């Protein structure tokens, strides 16, 4: 908790340097909870949900071939229709909150393409003469 | 949910192309649950179990050296006694349900060997002149 | 003499008979006891 959100106003490029700050903070009595068994449930539900959300994101990175990475490259080309901007307009002079608002509607298109790309890559690994 | 089980009647080879379809579907009120605290537990138990089953499979892939992969190679030889068939009898003209019935009794033998193989591989990585 | 090596697959379409607890779901549209214990809506077009 030394920047949980310190990069929020930074540009997209600059904010790429705090990815471990946000990730490490996303998976952070005695008798009362059992004597009054309403609160034991209220507390467990909050804990179970934090775990399920964490795992769903990890499963996607696994499927897309980005497991274990905070920054990962793929082979899906960027469609100009998703955002008609060049790199100097995206990485500089723009925040991640603004970018998310701009892309939002295309999130599922992009995710579907990332999954298709990884499956094609695996198919090419079961053919010993691949990519030649 | 576009094929949760669509490949069930396909051959083992053909079914290898839907591994992301099955994996992505294996880790998918308000007041009622706290007013009637029987159901809060019934629901949490179902959710906790889904998480524990997921994690046990991930731990095994980790131990065997197959983390992050849907298709993974190992160095354990296949024993002819486990199934005396050639590749043209296994990958074609056979389903995964049939294969599982055929192998079942040998599941633990195979898993034990996969763990031994990875440990031997690690030992060879702490000797800078390894495999020469 | 096949010289094959035990590969590992994850996401294999294999299933077994089992006993678990099922949850109730409703049409949303429905002071009725089953309108309260069956809150989660079903998909309007079930994926069969």
């Amino acid at each position, epitope marked *: 908790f030394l920047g949980f959100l310190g990069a929020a106003g930074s540009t997209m490029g600059a904010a790429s340097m705090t990815l471990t700050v946000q990730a490490r903070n996303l998976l952070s009595c005695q008798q009362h909870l059992l004597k009054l068994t309403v609160w034991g449930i209220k507390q467990l539900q909050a804990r179970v949900l934090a775990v399920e959300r964490y795992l769903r994101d990890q499963q996607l990175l696994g499927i897309w071939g980005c497991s274990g990475k905070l920054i990962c490259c793929t082979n899906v080309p960027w469609n100009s229709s998703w955002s008609n901007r060049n790199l100097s307009e995206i990485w500089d002079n723009m925040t991640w909150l603004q970018w998310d608002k701009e892309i939002s509607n295309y999130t599922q298109i992009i995710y579907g393409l990332l999954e298709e790309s990884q499956n094609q890559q695996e198919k090419n690994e079961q053919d010993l003469l691949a990519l030649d | 949910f576009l094929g949760f089980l669509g490949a069930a009647g396909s051959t083992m080879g053909a079914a290898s192309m839907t591994l992301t379809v099955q994996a992505r579907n294996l880790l998918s009120c308000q007041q009622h649950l706290l007013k009637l605290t029987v159901w809060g537990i019934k629901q949490l138990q179902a959710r906790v179990l889904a998480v524990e089953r997921y994690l046990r499979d991930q731990q095994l892939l980790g131990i065997w050296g197959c983390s992050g992969k849907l298709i993974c190679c190992t160095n354990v030889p296949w024993n002819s006694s486990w199934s005396n068939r050639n590749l*043209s009898e296994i990958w074609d003209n056979m389903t995964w349900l049939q294969w599982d019935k055929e192998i079942s009794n040998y599941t633990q033998i195979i898993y034990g060997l996969l763990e031994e193989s990875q440990n031997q591989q690690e030992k060879n990585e702490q000797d800078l002149l390894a495999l020469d | *003499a096949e010289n094959l090596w035990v590969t590992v697959y994850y996401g294999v379409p294999v299933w077994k008979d089992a006993e678990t607890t099922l949850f109730c779901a409703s049409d949303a549209k429905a002071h009725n006891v089953w309108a309260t214990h069956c809150c989660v809506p079903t998909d309007p077009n079930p994926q069969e």
Partner: antibody
Amino acid sequence: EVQLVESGPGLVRPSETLSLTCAVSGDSISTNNGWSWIRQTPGKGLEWIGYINGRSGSTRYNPSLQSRVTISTDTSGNQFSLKVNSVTAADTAKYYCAFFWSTYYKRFDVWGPGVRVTVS
Amino acid sequence: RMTQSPAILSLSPGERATLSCRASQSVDSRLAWYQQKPGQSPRLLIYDVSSRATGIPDRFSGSGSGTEFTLTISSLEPEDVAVYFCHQENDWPWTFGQGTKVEIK
């Protein structure tokens, strides 16, 4: 079952290029990988030249021939060919068209009769 | 690379042939053997050191690993007179041994 049929000049003069065409019957070049050329050099034996992926146009070549060899595919004719930049007497060999299938599940060859080419 | 030996195997009918092939570097198990008869394209016999190809009789077998490999032919018959080749698949360029002949009489 794939059949491989070859033709081209059996005589090339020194400093002239060499050109051989392999016709493919029974399957589509554009669908499979592993289309390749191998030659049998007298006094040396079999040597790999290179191969092409009919699905992409990507190729790989034996380093000793990277400065001279071109492999390409005719997707209309369903034939592929080998071209070699200027050749010398040292390139006299029996040249062959072959198809190599090598995957996790199957291994097989289709290997045609070849063309005898003399450089002189 | 790798080479084969004996260059010529002069064997009696019914005798077992032994043909070796030795690599200077490990090729793991990615080794195949081919049979060359006059006028024919090379025929695949054995792949992945010991696995027999479809349509090949049980008289053909083999073993080995890393750098030391052997092809054997049981009960030689006159139809088996051919030049046998050792083929390296483990890494590029793929290579062949010089080939050796098995002769029967």
